[PDB]
């Protein structure tokens, strides 16, 4: 009675022919008895070798960021021309933007809501910093991220967002994160989703783990009732991926 | 001195798809143009790929409109190694639209293209100042500050792949229209500052490019100015016209 489940593979900036091409032959090759939405998220520089290499037709190919509006803005790429490209998922509001390259809630709530508008399905990231989870703020602080997302979408917009909860805490500081502690977060979000939105809408949502997931602890984090499925890092760029995506069964 | 060789670069900003760019990708396969210019053509990122594969007139180059300095966890940025294993070797750096609106501080300007000269790349590195600074007549003391934090960071012998973009940012979407002779003042100035810093040798072979309003119809008024070496053009790339301009430069 869980959602589908979304495997989705993050690359971040990372790749080359070399390295991509033997790992995308792989997931061709993968096959699945189970219902799984498999996502990868190349750079953009990657995205057209793996449009034109990738066959699974379990996967779907993902932006890593995106703006709202094509025009004078060097350097970036817009949502309209990644509508034309054909790529139909985005990922917005990752750590590791909101850190260093300017993503403020307001803006992720931007690039959200012209998202959806435009058709696209988003995987939304949210999560806590190490000194955030110590004053207790790591509901306030998610809630927070989440509700300016929230606030511009319609109840329909809804069936085309996903959620992935970032352990930011977990990240170089000495903390690890344990599946008891995510699906307690998981939880949580469901809980406001359900608050605001209603029950259905609140049940079909997927909330994807985005903290550190591998073959070896993706099993036992996908027992947990409120996680469905996974933003893979690292493992990701590795053939142990098809092992992670096995383990959304 | 004698000009070095003149450089004609498009920057196509956030702006492409198939039916767009394929027209403008052809129009130059079929340019006849035959003069000793360094053309160049900044896609998206994912539009590189096919700009790469299309475009065939070997007086061209390919470039990214930004990149970062190393590869790694950095979620929807492009690094100058992923850049230089695509086969790109020419980079744009420090756009006044990045400085403005996408965190390009004057050092992490100077970071990347400092990086990027390492990288073997050739970088188009761009200053500027606003309406408000040269109001308050601080256009040298902008330019200058944004160009020293880049120089601070290279050796002499990257400066033979360093090329200089002017944009005047007072001009562009305000209702003040810069003149050729406006122009030549700040460019003027520039291989000045560089001529005193770094010596003649330097100061004679380095292109300092105008990056204002450049069109077919201006851009041959512009390139007679004496410290002017071509263009970082931006709409008017976007359109066939492109050519007449690259033509500007004989």
Not at 135 to 157: C, D, F, P, Y
Not at 184 to 210: F, M, N, P
Request: aromatic share 8%; charged share 20%; with cysteine.
């Amino acid at each position: 009675s869980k959602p589908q489940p979304i495997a989705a593979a993050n690359w971040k900036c990372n790749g080359s022919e070399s390295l991509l091409v033997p790992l995308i032959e792989t997931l061709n090759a993968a096959t699945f008895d189970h219902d799984v939405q498999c996502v990868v998220a190349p750079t953009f520089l990657h995205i057209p070798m793996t449009k034109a290499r990738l066959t699974n037709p379990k996967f779907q190919i993902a932006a890593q960021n995106a703006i709202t509006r094509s025009g004078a803005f060097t350097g970036e790429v817009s949502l309209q021309i990644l509508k034309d490209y054909g790529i139909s998922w985005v990922v917005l509001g990752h750590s590791e933007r909101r850190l260093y390259y300017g993503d403020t809630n307001e803006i992720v709530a931007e690039k959200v809501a012209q998202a959806c508008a435009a058709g696209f399905h988003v995987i939304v990231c949210v999560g806590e910093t190490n000194e955030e989870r110590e004053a207790g703020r790591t509901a306030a602080v998610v809630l927070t991220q989440l509700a300016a997302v929230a606030q511009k979408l319609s109840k329909e917009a809804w069936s085309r967002v996903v959620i992935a909860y970032e352990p930011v805490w977990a990240i170089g500081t000495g903390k690890v994160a344990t599946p008891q502690q995510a699906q307690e977060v998981h939880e949580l979000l469901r809980r406001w989703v359900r608050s605001k939105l209603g029950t259905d809408i609140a049940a079909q949502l997927r909330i994807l783990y985005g903290g550190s997931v591998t073959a070896k602890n993706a099993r036992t984090l996908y027992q947990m009732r409120d996680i469905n499925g996974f933003l893979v890092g690292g493992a990701s760029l590795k053939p142990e991926f098809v092992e992670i995506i096995e383990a959304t069964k």
